[PDB]
Structures are given as C-alpha cells and as structure tokens.
Design a protein around this ligand. Structure first.
Ligand code: 0KX
Ligand code: MG
Ligand code: MG
Length: 429
DNA sequence: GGCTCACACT
DNA sequence: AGTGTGAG
C-alpha cells in the first residue's frame, strides 16, 4: 500500500499581502488596523485585503470600507492605484515577483497565485541530509515551526509559544536521525529549509509569510493556514487521521464549491475522514472516475498532483465590471472602454515581452450582458499579431459587435455589464 | 461587492 | 473553439 510519503512539498503564502505592500511603502500604516480598498467613491471602496490588527475587530474582505469603519473606527485605508478608470494591480504584481525570485533560489516553484507558491523540496532535502549526515536537528533551527497534532499526552502549556515548543520537543525527541529514508525526518529537514527561505524573504523584502510543509500540495496548503500569521506548520502522514476526523470537507482545496457540496449531500457526511468508509468504486460512481480516485486517495492523505515548474502566469488579462445603471448602452461607450483595457494590456504585454522573452499570439474577448446570471455571456477569440492598443480594441469590437440586440446601431442592447480582454497562447521570442 | 488566474469538460 | 468551476 502506497503511503504518499515520497515527496516533501511546501506551500508559502504571504500574510495579508496587499496590506504588507502598502505598509512597507508607508511606515505610518505599520502595526495598525488597516485595509486595502479599490474604487473609493462608492461606499468608501471595496476592501480586498485586511491586516490582522483589523481582523480582530471583525473586518473582512467582503466589506465596503464605510461598513468596516463601523466595526473599526480607527481603520486606516490604502487605495489601489487607478489608471484609465480602472484598478491597477501593478504594484502588487511587482512585489510578488520580488518574493518569487527569492524562493526560486532554493528550489523550483509553482506560482499558485500572486502571493503564494508551492515548492518541491525533495531534492534539496536529500542533499541537506547527506551534508549533516548523522547530525541531530536542534530546536533552534525551527524557531517558528508548529507540529500538527502535538503536543500530546503528558503552566508553560498556558501560553501559545510554550505549547509550540513542547510539541516541537516531543517531535524532535521521537525522530530517528539515522535513517535518511524516514519520511518524518525528510519533512523535518524540509521545515528547516523553509525556515531559511522564509527568513530570506523577510530580510530581502520586509514581507512576512506563513508556510505549510507536508508530502503533497493539498496537505501543504491546509497546513499553511493552521498557524497564520508569521508561522509555519508541519503536517506529517501520521497526523492525518486525527486531523481529518473533524475537518469539514469544504476546507480541502477544490472542495470549497459545488463538488464539495455534492460530496456532503450525496454521502451524508461532514468531515474529510468519513470518506475512508467508501470504496474507490463507490466514490467514482458518484463523482466520476477522476474525482472518485482523487477523493479515495485524498481522505487517506495521499495526493500525486506534481509541483509544476511554472513561475510565470500563462495568461495576461484585464477586465472591468459595469454593474446596474453603469452598464454600457452605446457603441461609442463600449469602444472607449475597450480602448482603455487594450491600452493597459499593451503596457503589460510589452513589459512581458522584454522581461520574459515571449509573445502572446491569441486575443480573447469576453463580455456579460445585463440580466445574465452567467459571469460570461459570451467568449470569442481572434489572432493577436501586433502589440497595438488601437488594433486590439478594434479587433475586439469586431468580434462582439454582432451581439448587439438593437436596430439603431448607435445604441447597444442589451447593455454590457462586463468587458474582459485576455492575451493567451504565448510563444518564445 | 471587483480584478485576476488555472483548468476540466465537451 | 467555447463553457463552466474554483481560487486568491
Ligand atoms: N478574493 C481575493 C483574494 C485575494 N486577493 C488578493 C489580496 C490578498 O492580499 C492577496 C492574497 O490573497 P490571500 O493569501 O488569500 N489573503 P491575504 O494574503 O491578504 O491574507 P492571509 O490570510 O493570507 O494572511 O490576493 C484578492 O484580491 N481577492
Ligand atoms: Mg496570503
Ligand atoms: Mg494566498
């Protein structure tokens, strides 16, 4: 029986990342309840990131700033840059690149989002094990590490840091240093490397982050969120049974949506651990061959999804919603906004070509019409042969112009509630 | 609520 | 090629 203990995988995720970017730039924001917002004019702006100090007051990502102020009167705000009537996330993408570049020094990474990346530490661990061969691992090498499930059995325990240490001590005391093979030893050395990586990030960028270390991406991601912020968590294969016994299905990556809901509804269960009851065939019959096999393995802590060697996004896109009364109702209006989106896209693509030695070859245009529940009413694509904003916007209109319901042709019906331009199908240059 | 991304399915 | 789900 395979135990899925073949790899050491880590997930590193920045703490309150957009807030940290603004806090680094503006020292007045440091160590205070603050949030990052976009489009200040409406209800003070929509919050997209929240500092831990602000989270203590109950401020969340969903909220309008005016509403967040009601919970947290002293809340400080930082505004996302606005360009061409649109939120521009350039500052945060550049900050992301800073972090990713540092991580790449230690190992090959998969960029999972703007503020997180998976790391395959398997090779690095082998090397490190040989280098310090026969040498026991000190607790001092793991100053911010939690061992999930520990401490166990028999006032220091009254304080969080006291508990962390006791668990770490119990873990280390148990490790067999000899035996380079031991998965637990491999995860431990993995955590040592992650400590160093996290230290390099903070020293060179000033940003703090949390991390998870386990044998696969799903567990690594789950581990990461266990002790945020500014801490890392090691989830061993052995900790899985107890961990999953009370773990809501929706917590597992990819189960947070309809699929997760269907697992709960069809099987009549609540926790990830209860999945172990069912045969692989049973799971496949309900949720399909691929999903069924994945679930059967996952509830036992086993997953084989590889850490893909990809540091750069596959697509570059910008979009804007025009909700309610703001929906675009004229041909001229639609064309003007297409131009704004195309202009920002051109800037980003030009930088991309210079920085990354690649060119996009396909242009995708997506729109939403008023009254449509679907996020995208229509998607169409055309060739992208020139990095020219006017051509791109002109081409995008050509592709969608037939969508217009109205006879006048100076007026657009139904009104458009969303425009989206995306460059794809990159090739080396 | 808003701006982005990746990927499975057909 | 075009649609839908999931996420951060
Ligand atoms: N729905 C979302 C989720 C995240 N983001 C952005 C803002 C976040 O700061 C950044 C990182 O996402 P996130 O890791 O899930 N949360 P954040 O980093 O702010 O706080 P942590 O919980 O990770 O400490 O992406 C967004 O713009 N819209
Ligand atoms: Mg984060
Ligand atoms: Mg994140």
């Amino acid at each position: 029986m395979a135990t899925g203990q073949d790899r050491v995988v880590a997930l590193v995720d920045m703490d309150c990342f957009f807030v940290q970017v603004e806090q680094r730039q503006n020292p007045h924001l440091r160590n205070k309840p603050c949030a990052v917002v976009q489009y200040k004019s409406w209800k003070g702006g929509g919050i997209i990131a929240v500092s831990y100090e602000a989270r203590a007051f109950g401020v969340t990502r969903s909220m309008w700033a005016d509403d967040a102020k009601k919970l947290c009167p002293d809340l400080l705000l930082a505004q996302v840059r606005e360009s061409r009537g649109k939120a521009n996330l350039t500052k945060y993408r550049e900050a992301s690149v800073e972090v990713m570049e540092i991580m790449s020094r230690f190992a090959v990474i998969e960029r999972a989002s703007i503020d997180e990346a998976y790391v395959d530490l398997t090779s690095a661990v082998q090397e490190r094990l040989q280098k310090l061969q026969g040498q026991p691992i000190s607790a001092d090498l793991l100053p911010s590490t939690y061992i999930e499930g520990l401490p166990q059995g028999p006032e220091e325990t009254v304080q969080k840091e006291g508990m962390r240490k006791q668990g770490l001590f119990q873990w280390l005391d148990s490790l067999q240093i000899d035996n380079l093979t031991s998965p637990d030893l491999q995860l431990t050395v993995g955590a040592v490397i992650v400590e160093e990586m996290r230290a390099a990030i903070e020293r060179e960028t000033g940003f703090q982050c949390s991390a998870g270390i386990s044998h696969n991406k799903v567990l690594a991601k789950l581990a990461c969120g266990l002790n945020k912020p500014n801490r890392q968590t090691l989830v061993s294969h052995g900790s899985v049974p107890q961990l999953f016994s009370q773990m809501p299905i929706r917590k597992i990556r990819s189960l947070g949506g309809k699929l997760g809901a269907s697992v709960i509804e069809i099987l009549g269960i609540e926790y990830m651990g209860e999945l172990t009851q069912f045969t692989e065939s049973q799971l496949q019959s309900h949720f399909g061959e691929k999903n069924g096999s994945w679930l059967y393995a996952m509830c036992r802590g086993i997953e084989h999804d590889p850490v893909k060697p990809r540091q750069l996004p596959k697509t570059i896109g910008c979009s804007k919603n025009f909700p309610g009364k703001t929906a675009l109702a004229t041909r001229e209006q639609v064309q003007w906004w297409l131009l704004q989106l195309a202009q920002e896209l051109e800037e980003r693509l030009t930088k991309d070509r210079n920085d990354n030695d690649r060119v996009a070859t396909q242009l995708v245009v997506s729109i939403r019409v008023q009254g449509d529940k679907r996020l995208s009413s229509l998607r169409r694509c055309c060739a992208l042969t020139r990095y020219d904003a006017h051509k791109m916007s002109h081409d995008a209109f050509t592709v969608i112009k037939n969508c217009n319901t109205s006879g006048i042709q100076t007026e657009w019906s139904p009104p458009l509630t969303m425009l989206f331009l995306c460059a794809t199908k990159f090739s080396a240059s």
